[PDB]
């Protein structure tokens, strides 16, 4: 966290800084998208964070 | 009147600031 890295989450790849979110997902959701249909949040698979 | 960086788009500020335009007006 708090560094940018070539990340992957269940095959959701990207590059960016990872930091903790005030947003809550529903129990079944895995990643978040902005108004521009682009990814801006993701859940950790092992820590559900 | 009421009012993306992830995709290489940058929306850099104007030269004159709003408090400077306020001084000219
Ligand atoms: C995947 O394995 C990790 C352990 O490596 C699990 O994380 C543990 O979760 C339990 C219960 O919440 C905690 O008591 C442990 O402290 C956790 N361990 C660590 C080191 O994180 C995790 O729950 C597992 N995931 C699944 C889906 O089973």
PDB file of C-alpha atoms and ligand atoms in Angstrom:
ATOM      1  CA  UNK A   1       0.000   0.000   0.000  1.00  0.00           C
ATOM      2  CA  UNK A   2       0.940   3.737  -0.248  1.00  0.00           C
ATOM      3  CA  UNK A   3       3.245   2.962  -3.214  1.00  0.00           C
ATOM      4  CA  UNK A   4       2.318   2.468  -6.891  1.00  0.00           C
ATOM      5  CA  UNK A   5       2.754  -1.028  -8.251  1.00  0.00           C
ATOM      6  CA  UNK A   6       1.807  -3.275 -11.201  1.00  0.00           C
ATOM      7  CA  UNK A   7      -1.185  -4.819  -9.450  1.00  0.00           C
ATOM      8  CA  UNK A   8      -3.519  -7.733 -10.136  1.00  0.00           C
ATOM      9  CA  UNK A   9      -6.699  -8.832  -8.284  1.00  0.00           C
ATOM     10  CA  UNK A  10      -8.441 -12.013  -9.564  1.00  0.00           C
ATOM     11  CA  UNK A  11      -7.209 -10.981 -13.137  1.00  0.00           C
ATOM     12  CA  UNK A  12      -8.218  -7.358 -12.662  1.00  0.00           C
ATOM     13  CA  UNK A  13      -4.836  -5.919 -13.644  1.00  0.00           C
ATOM     14  CA  UNK A  14      -3.635  -2.346 -13.421  1.00  0.00           C
ATOM     15  CA  UNK A  15      -0.915   0.092 -12.282  1.00  0.00           C
ATOM     16  CA  UNK A  16      -1.447   2.608  -9.457  1.00  0.00           C
ATOM     17  CA  UNK A  17      -1.292   3.523  -5.756  1.00  0.00           C
ATOM     18  CA  UNK A  18      -3.357   1.293  -3.451  1.00  0.00           C
ATOM     19  CA  UNK A  19      -4.974   2.953  -0.386  1.00  0.00           C
ATOM     20  CA  UNK A  20      -7.946   2.097   1.935  1.00  0.00           C
ATOM     21  CA  UNK A  21     -11.484   3.246   0.971  1.00  0.00           C
ATOM     22  CA  UNK A  22     -14.394   4.735   2.906  1.00  0.00           C
ATOM     23  CA  UNK A  23     -16.734   3.156   0.255  1.00  0.00           C
ATOM     24  CA  UNK A  24     -18.723  -0.029   1.200  1.00  0.00           C
ATOM     25  CA  UNK A  25     -19.571  -2.683  -1.419  1.00  0.00           C
ATOM     26  CA  UNK A  26     -22.486  -5.149  -1.298  1.00  0.00           C
ATOM     27  CA  UNK A  27     -21.379  -8.681  -0.288  1.00  0.00           C
ATOM     28  CA  UNK A  28     -21.192 -10.012  -3.899  1.00  0.00           C
ATOM     29  CA  UNK A  29     -19.274  -7.127  -5.611  1.00  0.00           C
ATOM     30  CA  UNK A  30     -15.507  -7.281  -6.368  1.00  0.00           C
ATOM     31  CA  UNK A  31     -14.488  -3.980  -8.045  1.00  0.00           C
ATOM     32  CA  UNK A  32     -15.794  -0.429  -8.451  1.00  0.00           C
ATOM     33  CA  UNK A  33     -16.111   1.734 -11.472  1.00  0.00           C
ATOM     34  CA  UNK A  34     -16.223   5.514 -11.858  1.00  0.00           C
ATOM     35  CA  UNK A  35     -18.770   7.520 -13.973  1.00  0.00           C
ATOM     36  CA  UNK A  36     -16.379   7.124 -16.959  1.00  0.00           C
ATOM     37  CA  UNK A  37     -16.896   3.266 -16.788  1.00  0.00           C
ATOM     38  CA  UNK A  38     -13.242   2.968 -15.543  1.00  0.00           C
ATOM     39  CA  UNK A  39     -11.990   1.098 -12.447  1.00  0.00           C
ATOM     40  CA  UNK A  40     -11.361   3.115  -9.279  1.00  0.00           C
ATOM     41  CA  UNK A  41     -11.766   0.570  -6.415  1.00  0.00           C
ATOM     42  CA  UNK A  42     -11.153  -3.155  -5.826  1.00  0.00           C
ATOM     43  CA  UNK A  43     -11.711  -5.697  -2.996  1.00  0.00           C
ATOM     44  CA  UNK A  44      -8.838  -7.824  -1.709  1.00  0.00           C
ATOM     45  CA  UNK A  45      -9.712 -11.499  -2.347  1.00  0.00           C
ATOM     46  CA  UNK A  46      -8.203 -12.775   0.939  1.00  0.00           C
ATOM     47  CA  UNK A  47      -8.948  -9.856   3.308  1.00  0.00           C
ATOM     48  CA  UNK A  48     -12.240  -8.708   1.732  1.00  0.00           C
ATOM     49  CA  UNK A  49     -10.992  -5.102   2.185  1.00  0.00           C
TER      50      UNK A  49
ATOM     51  CA  UNK B   1     -22.650  27.803 -12.481  1.00  0.00           C
ATOM     52  CA  UNK B   2     -21.589  24.294 -11.242  1.00  0.00           C
ATOM     53  CA  UNK B   3     -18.881  21.733 -12.142  1.00  0.00           C
ATOM     54  CA  UNK B   4      -9.836  11.507 -14.925  1.00  0.00           C
ATOM     55  CA  UNK B   5      -6.049  11.867 -14.401  1.00  0.00           C
ATOM     56  CA  UNK B   6      -5.800   8.034 -14.604  1.00  0.00           C
ATOM     57  CA  UNK B   7      -6.129   8.242 -18.449  1.00  0.00           C
ATOM     58  CA  UNK B   8      -3.369  10.772 -19.310  1.00  0.00           C
ATOM     59  CA  UNK B   9      -5.865  13.707 -19.453  1.00  0.00           C
ATOM     60  CA  UNK B  10      -4.715  16.843 -17.618  1.00  0.00           C
ATOM     61  CA  UNK B  11      -6.795  19.954 -16.975  1.00  0.00           C
ATOM     62  CA  UNK B  12      -4.145  22.433 -15.962  1.00  0.00           C
ATOM     63  CA  UNK B  13      -5.127  25.809 -14.405  1.00  0.00           C
ATOM     64  CA  UNK B  14      -5.623  29.144 -16.253  1.00  0.00           C
ATOM     65  CA  UNK B  15      -2.971  31.876 -16.102  1.00  0.00           C
ATOM     66  CA  UNK B  16      -5.194  34.448 -14.432  1.00  0.00           C
ATOM     67  CA  UNK B  17      -6.741  33.184 -11.153  1.00  0.00           C
ATOM     68  CA  UNK B  18     -10.298  34.037 -10.136  1.00  0.00           C
ATOM     69  CA  UNK B  19      -9.080  36.372  -7.356  1.00  0.00           C
ATOM     70  CA  UNK B  20      -6.933  38.171 -10.015  1.00  0.00           C
ATOM     71  CA  UNK B  21      -9.887  38.455 -12.459  1.00  0.00           C
ATOM     72  CA  UNK B  22     -11.856  39.803  -9.529  1.00  0.00           C
ATOM     73  CA  UNK B  23      -9.206  42.512  -9.128  1.00  0.00           C
ATOM     74  CA  UNK B  24      -9.350  43.509 -12.870  1.00  0.00           C
ATOM     75  CA  UNK B  25     -13.161  43.682 -12.800  1.00  0.00           C
TER      76      UNK B  25
HETATM   77  C1  LIG C   1      -7.169 -17.279   3.303  1.00  0.00           C
HETATM   78  O1  LIG C   1      -6.187 -17.616   4.256  1.00  0.00           O
HETATM   79  C2  LIG C   1      -5.961 -16.595   5.239  1.00  0.00           C
HETATM   80  C3  LIG C   1      -4.854 -17.102   6.136  1.00  0.00           C
HETATM   81  O2  LIG C   1      -3.580 -16.967   5.521  1.00  0.00           O
HETATM   82  C4  LIG C   1      -7.249 -16.284   6.003  1.00  0.00           C
HETATM   83  O3  LIG C   1      -7.024 -15.127   6.798  1.00  0.00           O
HETATM   84  C5  LIG C   1      -7.276 -15.457   8.175  1.00  0.00           C
HETATM   85  O4  LIG C   1      -8.630 -15.211   8.550  1.00  0.00           O
HETATM   86  C6  LIG C   1      -8.905 -15.660   9.875  1.00  0.00           C
HETATM   87  C7  LIG C   1     -10.396 -15.523  10.161  1.00  0.00           C
HETATM   88  O5  LIG C   1     -10.845 -14.232   9.731  1.00  0.00           O
HETATM   89  C8  LIG C   1      -8.081 -14.846  10.865  1.00  0.00           C
HETATM   90  O6  LIG C   1      -8.315 -15.327  12.194  1.00  0.00           O
HETATM   91  C9  LIG C   1      -6.595 -14.947  10.541  1.00  0.00           C
HETATM   92  O7  LIG C   1      -5.865 -14.018  11.349  1.00  0.00           O
HETATM   93  C10 LIG C   1      -6.340 -14.649   9.068  1.00  0.00           C
HETATM   94  N1  LIG C   1      -4.960 -14.944   8.734  1.00  0.00           N
HETATM   95  C11 LIG C   1      -4.211 -14.083   8.050  1.00  0.00           C
HETATM   96  C12 LIG C   1      -2.730 -14.205   8.253  1.00  0.00           C
HETATM   97  O8  LIG C   1      -4.699 -13.248   7.305  1.00  0.00           O
HETATM   98  C13 LIG C   1      -8.404 -16.007   5.048  1.00  0.00           C
HETATM   99  O9  LIG C   1      -9.625 -15.938   5.775  1.00  0.00           O
HETATM  100  C14 LIG C   1      -8.507 -17.100   3.994  1.00  0.00           C
HETATM  101  N2  LIG C   1      -9.552 -16.790   3.034  1.00  0.00           N
HETATM  102  C15 LIG C   1     -10.585 -17.604   2.797  1.00  0.00           C
HETATM  103  C16 LIG C   1     -11.573 -17.132   1.773  1.00  0.00           C
HETATM  104  O10 LIG C   1     -10.718 -18.674   3.381  1.00  0.00           O
END
